[PDB]
Write a protein that binds this ligand. Structure first.
Ligand code: SF4
Ligand code: SF4
Ligand code: FES
Ligand SMILES: [K+]
Ligand SMILES: [Zn+2]
Lengths: 129, 691, 48, 207, 116, 96, 86
């Protein structure tokens, strides 16, 4: 294989000290790892394919001059994308973020029958089309 | 071995018989375009947007309705399919109005998006367009029917899901119109859902009109607290303000629906809010103060009272973290008078066994039942999404439903056995003919409403219903794993309080009136100052000034369910948590942090300083409270029934009357909804009228 | 404009203004929206 | 041909494919994947140990002669175990052709400096170190090049916030510019723009 | 295995620790020049205590590669100071002189806002 | 139009006005509160209703491509006018 | 100073809770008869180690692990709690 002499390191991978993040935004943050829910206003499912990581929402207040929404949270907009739940968890662990994982919610397969609309003796008979 | 082999663009997929072409493409991750098809509605096949080419078949088929046949190769991207989509999209847009800038659907419109992905990029329609009159169907759903594409989703939803047959089509051809023909309001507890299913801007939220565009909103996935179903929701916020509530799919709870109160009562969060601590001044009036001063006043009283001199009542919207914090604080002055407004009989097992106060069959288990007996409940209004599940099973599983109580309109036909509670005696003994139907049933389900347990004879009713359930379950007919006895709760905080060892009801407080009363969001008015010693020191903690706050000595502004990460347990015993969508207003604070801060001032510091720590505390009291999205089964029905028969209590003669008889009683049932201006318009509409 | 005058509108300023910065007529920004959260107003009478 | 559709060049596509196989046959020890894009760009994906050998061969071999290092950059992909993709874009004036060589690394694995092969790489690797935090072994002078002195973090990482963590102002009490945690009078507004409908079937991924 | 990795400079923590102590000595001797050269208003004692505080906060590391990068970054920081690429503002940014002390107890945080 | 609050501050066409105890009105001392005095709600109401002889009429706001997207307005209801969603002009069917 | 509340945590299926499950099925009803006004909260949750919690006056709590206990050991563990205050 390699000509480069490797070493053995059994430490858990932790990069908190070399990321430059302030202490406040490592230990007091909660990361949420989830697959986004489908926007119920539309039938397209293409935004439910990937895993996302977001952070706990913090205060927003009104700017005295204009009424704009101010924030002191540097992570308020950070959203990361991941192929699998395991990739998202691995990223959160090595960055030292506490996290919750929410299992993916796949719609269950349905039994669809057009003929059922015209049942002779069942309640599925439609009164209109 | 019943699966057949079909191909999607040449890739083999094995599907069960009856699978449609559209469902076969789903299995390989290909989403066929659609407008009329909805997987939770009856197939319609009228929009023709799902047309697809079958290899070697000269005619395109409607993928949403065509059953796939063995060996078929579905070409989802052939020129023939693409030309069919372009042709259909062209017809849809010919008469559609140029409304996108003024239409609320813009930015989350399936017509816009499928036009971009599957339609042409230009128009060759050189005529004038159709224009249609608008229909008024109430104060929740705005109609701009010139945008309607006649997909009939709303008609099929109203008929099949909501059980209302007010929507139809009138006329013929290009002038065919969706509506009610006469002037009629589509007032149903599930009406707001026709906004979501409508693919276009024809049906939109009237309260939401013009306020935001979809791309600019932030989505906070959360839980509903308007009832005990625990509907999953998305809270849309923009620049720190709540904008709307949308459903979030959960197959085992609300599917993809929510009730109108869940959808539209959020505007009550902007009114009558408690934003600053308040104390009584020398003139006996509530005046704003600091957190330091308000807590010092409360801490001083708490340090001078012990035992039965201290008590607490928890209202219907309190979270588990706040409940456990208050219980721990009152336990540290050796007080056990931790009460809830909602009664649940303490006779027999009481709250010792979870199975005694849960919906043991679970919401999704209704679809497996073959008989349902409803007792003293109007599920249509107490748990609208649970009632929709019953109608779904009534529709598709031919479920038999019987009701003991007032004959309310459940949106499906049922068997009314009467309203006297003595019928429960007949069914148990076998005298009643319906007793035989339960014995026949393989999977009977008996549901007792928490509202029926507010009667002074609630222990007798629960014993009677449990006697019916146990005579059935421990006998031939039902498997060992099928659970028959169910309680249907209507209060979001009730099950968590029971899990934590609270006393249900305020009988304990009435027996031994206290000198210091904590009202934790308690706005039912069950205990007023006429029931307390003249000098009672009342502390109200909550988010709305309503019933509890006016009579308090100290007001501590807490947060609403949109403003905290809090645990709620639904009627099945499933623990779920909200997420912060916006922070609490003004000086309001997370509710468990108020109690934790109070304990530090009082010299009784609780042993948790973070949310995770107070949740570790929840695990020590009831481990299921931190098992989020899991339903933990509860056993020992026989033991509960043995303790239930020890004391025989006599049923009262008065018939079972649900607190909610008509839709007008549905809209306002808690502090948030009572402050909602939208809910007030709904009450006016159903009472006065459209005028 | 003596040859091709501008189209007349009722809302067009009849009196043009020069740059008002640094004077008492200067523009001062402010939020044009109304208060969003209404706070509860306690009753003006003692409990009892 | 179609006036709005970019025309394909099949001769260049075949030439680049044949040369890609040529490279993979000569350096099997390092080449992991070779691909040619539909707009005719050749990418050689290699094991990170092959940086110096592969780049040296491409520069000096008679049938390659990629004398010019057009650009050297990195890409951060948090979902990968080796989140950092290192991209070398090379130009051959002799054969009027371009090639892209890619490798990978994580936060703790050094990459070998290519300054011996291309002296152009000196500042490009300082920029990668500064912006991504990738260390380059045996670099003559590796240090920040674009960020402020003492700046903490690597701002082109996908998990570094757009507005950073600190901001500057002049403070009259201490008579100097000072750094303080970032507060924004108007928060940056995140927009969700992705359509929930698939745009490109040709790129669909297995479920 | 997946634990067989490429080192940066140190093949184990004992080699890494030597580099840490060498970096610490270099910083320790630089502080008097830095205070003089940048005409800082802090004492040499304050500067050296700040150096010790920075080393202590990373005392819990057990991965030699992480320690290697900490030393690499620490040496870049030292070079910026010695060569006077930094200005006095950059040196004084370690001391947060204009930042008010944020409360640390539960009650004090409770009174001011919503953050834990 | 432009009315005034009890404190003397003008009310904007969006209804904005600092209340009595709002310190933020200090920003207007020695300066002024910019208010636009042509309230569009009052101006559109002055316009007369167009009488047309058909069930459906179209509006593009006038000026062709200088107006708004062309929309078609149904005039079947006789208890109200048809209003243009873009420019607010009103139409009424004559006779029928 | 006396006992205020009893909580029994256990799993529905794990063998480590088999004795606790036996105690409930055989003896809980009799235990509740003798102690009519004592809360005895039985809370089942999958994959938890069984435990007995006793809450005494002024919020003091003791927990006893019941892992792999027999029904009789559970009885004696409950007897000590009911008898000895804390
Ligand atoms: S329904 Fe869709 S396409 Fe029609 S006007 Fe509204 S946003 Fe535009
Ligand atoms: S109103 Fe909406 S849901 Fe109903 S038929 Fe028209 S487009 Fe379909
Ligand atoms: S989705 Fe199949 S015809 Fe409408
Ligand atoms: K809609
Ligand atoms: Zn117009």
């Amino acid at each position: 294989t390699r000509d480069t002499q490797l070493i053995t390191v059994d430490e858990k991978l932790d990069i908190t000290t070399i990321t430059g993040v302030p202490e406040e935004h490592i230990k007091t943050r909660k990361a949420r790892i989830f697959v986004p829910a489908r926007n119920n206003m539309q039938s397209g499912v293409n935004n439910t394919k990937k895993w996302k990581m977001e952070f706990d929402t913090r205060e927003r207040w009104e700017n005295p001059l204009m009424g704009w929404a101010s924030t002191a949270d540097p992570l308020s907009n950070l959203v990361l994308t991941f192929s699998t739940k395991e990739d998202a968890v691995a990223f959160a662990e090595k960055n030292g973020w506490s996290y919750d994982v929410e299992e993916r919610k796949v719609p269950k397969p349905k039994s669809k029958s057009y003929g059922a609309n015209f049942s002779w003796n069942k309640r599925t008979r439609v009164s209109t089309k | 071995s019943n699966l057949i082999e079909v191909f999607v663009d040449g890739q083999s997929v094995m599907v069960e018989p009856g699978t449609t072409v559209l469902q076969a493409c789903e299995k390989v991750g290909m989403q066929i375009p659609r407008f009329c098809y909805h997987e939770r509605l009856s197939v319609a096949g009228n929009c023709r947007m799902c047309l697809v080419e079958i290899e070697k078949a000269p005619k395109v088929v409607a993928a949403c309705a065509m059953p796939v046949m063995k060996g078929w190769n579905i070409l989802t991207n052939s020129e023939k399919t693409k030309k069919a989509r372009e042709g259909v999209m062209e017809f849809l847009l010919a008469n559609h109005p140029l409304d996108c800038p003024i239409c609320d659907q813009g930015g989350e419109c399936d017509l816009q998006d499928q036009s971009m992905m599957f339609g042409s990029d230009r128009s060759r329609f050189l005529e004038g367009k159709r224009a249609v009159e608008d229909k008024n169907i109430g104060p929740l759903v705005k109609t701009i029917m010139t945008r309607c594409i006649q997909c009939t989703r709303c008609i099929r939803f109203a008929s099949e899901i909501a059980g209302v047959d007010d929507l139809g089509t009138t006329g013929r051809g290009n002038d065919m119109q969706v509506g009610t023909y006469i002037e009629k309001m589509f007032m149903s507890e599930l009406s707001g859902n026709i906004i979501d299913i409508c693919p276009v801007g024809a049906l939109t939220s009237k309260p939401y009109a013009f306020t935001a565009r979809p791309w600019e909103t932030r989505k906070t996935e959360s839980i509903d607290v308007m009832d005990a179903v625990g509907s999953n929701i998305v809270v849309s916020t923009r620049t720190g303000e709540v904008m709307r509530i949308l459903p979030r799919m959960h197959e085992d709870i609300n599917e993809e629906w929510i009730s109108d109160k869940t959808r539209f009562a959020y505007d009550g969060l902007k009114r009558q809010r408690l934003t600053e601590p308040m104390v009584r001044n020398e003139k006996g009036l509530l005046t704003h103060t600091t957190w330091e001063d308000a807590l010092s006043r409360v801490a001083g009283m708490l340090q001078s009272f012990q035992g039965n001199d201290v008590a607490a009542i928890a209202g219907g919207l309190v979270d588990a973290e706040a409940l456990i914090a208050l219980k721990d604080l009152l336990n540290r002055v050796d007080s056990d008078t931790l009460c809830t407004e909602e009664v649940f009989p303490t006779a027999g097992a009481g709250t010792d066994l979870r199975s005694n106060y849960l919906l043991n069959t679970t919401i999704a288990g209704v679809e497996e039942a073959d008989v349902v007996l409803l007792v003293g409940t109007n599920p249509r209004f107490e748990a609208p999404l649970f009632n929709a599940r019953i109608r779904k099973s009534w529709l598709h599983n031919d479920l038999k439903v019987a009701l003991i109580g007032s004959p309310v309109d459940l949106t499906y036909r049922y068997d009314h056995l009467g309203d006297s509670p003595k019928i429960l005696q007949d069914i148990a003994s076998g005298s009643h003919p319906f007793s035989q139907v339960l014995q026949e049933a393989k999977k009977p389900m008996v549901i007792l409403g928490s509202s029926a347990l507010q009667r002074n004879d609630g222990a007798a009713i629960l014993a009677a219903v449990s006697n019916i359930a146990q005579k059935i379950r421990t006998s031939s007919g039902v498997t060992g794993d099928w659970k028959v006895m169910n309680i249907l709760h209507r209060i979001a905080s009730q099950v968590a309080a029971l899990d934590l060892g609270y006393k249900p009801g305020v009988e304990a407080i009435q027996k031994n009136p206290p000198k210091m009363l904590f009202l934790l969001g308690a706005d039912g008015g069950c205990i007023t100052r006429q029931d307390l010693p003249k000098d009672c020191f009342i502390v109200y903690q909550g988010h709305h000034g309503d019933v509890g706050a006016p009579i308090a000595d100290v007001i501590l502004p807490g947060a609403a369910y949109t403003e905290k990460s809090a645990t709620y347990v639904n009627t099945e015993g499933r623990a779920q948590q909200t997420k912060v969508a916006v922070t609490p207003p003004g000086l309001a604070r997370e509710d468990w942090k108020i109690i934790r801060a109070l304990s530090e001032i009082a010299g009784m510091t609780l042993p948790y300083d973070t949310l995770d720590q107070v949740r570790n505390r929840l695990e020590e009291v009831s481990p299921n409270l931190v098992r989020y999205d899991d339903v933990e089964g509860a056993n020992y029905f026989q033991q509960a029934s043995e303790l239930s028969k020890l004391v025989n209590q006599q049923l009262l003669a008065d018939p079972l009357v649900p607190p909610q008889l008509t839709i007008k009683d549905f809209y306002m049932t808690d502090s948030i909804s009572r402050a909602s201006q939208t809910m007030a318009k709904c009450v006016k509409a159903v009472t006065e009228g459209a005028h | 404009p003596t040859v091709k005058p501008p189209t007349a509108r009722k809302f067009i300023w009849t009196n043009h203004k020069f740059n008002l910065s640094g004077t008492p007529q200067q523009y001062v920004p402010y939020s044009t929206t109304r208060k969003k959260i209404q706070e509860w107003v306690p009753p003006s009478t003692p409990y009892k | 041909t179609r006036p709005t559709v970019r025309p394909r060049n099949d001769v260049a596509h075949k030439q680049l494919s044949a040369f890609g196989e040529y490279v993979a046959e000569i350096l099997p020890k390092y080449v992991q994947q070779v691909q040619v894009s539909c707009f005719n760009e050749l990418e050689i994906c290699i094991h990170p140990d092959g940086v110096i050998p592969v780049l040296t061969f491409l520069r000096d071999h008679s049938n390659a002669q990629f004398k010019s290092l057009a650009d050297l950059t990195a890409v951060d992909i948090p979902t990968r175990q080796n989140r950092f993709e290192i991209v070398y874009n090379l130009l051959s004036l002799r054969f009027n052709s371009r090639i892209r060589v890619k490798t990978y690394t994580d936060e703790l694995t050094p990459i070998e400096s290519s300054v011996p092969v291309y002296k152009a790489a000196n500042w490009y690797e300082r920029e990668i170190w500064d912006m991504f935090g990738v260390f380059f072994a045996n670099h003559p002078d590796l240090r920040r090049i674009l960020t402020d002195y003492g700046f903490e973090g690597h701002p082109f990482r996908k998990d570094f916030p757009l507005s950073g963590y600190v901001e500057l102002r002049y403070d009259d009490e201490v008579k100097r510019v000072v750094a303080e945690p970032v507060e924004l009078a108007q928060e940056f507004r995140k927009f969700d723009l992705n359509s929930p409908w698939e745009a490109f079937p040709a790129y669909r991924q297995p479920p | 295995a997946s634990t067989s990795v490429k080192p940066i400079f140190s093949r184990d923590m004992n080699e890494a620790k030597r580099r840490v102590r060498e970096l610490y000595r270099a910083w320790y001797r630089e502080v008097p020049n830095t205070v003089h050269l940048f005409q800082l208003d802090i004492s040499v004692k304050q500067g050296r205590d700040k150096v010790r505080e920075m080393f202590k906060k990373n005392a819990h590391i057990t991965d030699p590669r992480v320690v290697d990068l900490l030393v690499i970054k620490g040496k870049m920081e030292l070079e910026e100071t010695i060569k006077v690429w930094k200005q006095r503002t950059h040196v004084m940014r370690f001391f947060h002189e204009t930042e008010a002390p944020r409360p640390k107890d539960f009650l004090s945080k409770f009174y001011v806002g919503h953050d834990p | 139009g432009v009315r005034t609050s009890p404190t003397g501050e003008k009310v904007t066409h969006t209804g904005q006005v600092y209340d009595d105890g709002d310190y933020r009105k200090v920003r207007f001392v020695g300066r002024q509160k910019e208010v636009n005095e042509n309230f569009a709600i009052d101006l559109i109401a002055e316009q007369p209703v167009s009488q047309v002889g058909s069930r459906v009429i179209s509006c593009d706001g006038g000026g062709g491509a200088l107006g708004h997207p062309r929309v078609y307005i149904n005039l079947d209801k006789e208890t109200k006018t048809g209003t243009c969603g873009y420019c607010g002009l009103q139409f009424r069917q004559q006779h029928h | 100073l006396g006992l205020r509340e009893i909580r029994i945590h256990l799993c529905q299926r794990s063998p480590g809770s088999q004795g606790v499950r036996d105690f409930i099925e055989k003896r809980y009803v009799e235990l509740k008869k003798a102690n009519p006004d004592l809360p005895i909260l039985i809370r089942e949750c999958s994959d938890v180690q069984p435990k007995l919690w006793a809450r005494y006056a002024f919020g003091q709590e003791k927990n006893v692990s019941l892992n792999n206990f027999s029904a009789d050991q559970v009885t004696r563990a409950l007897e000590n709690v009911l008898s000895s205050k804390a």
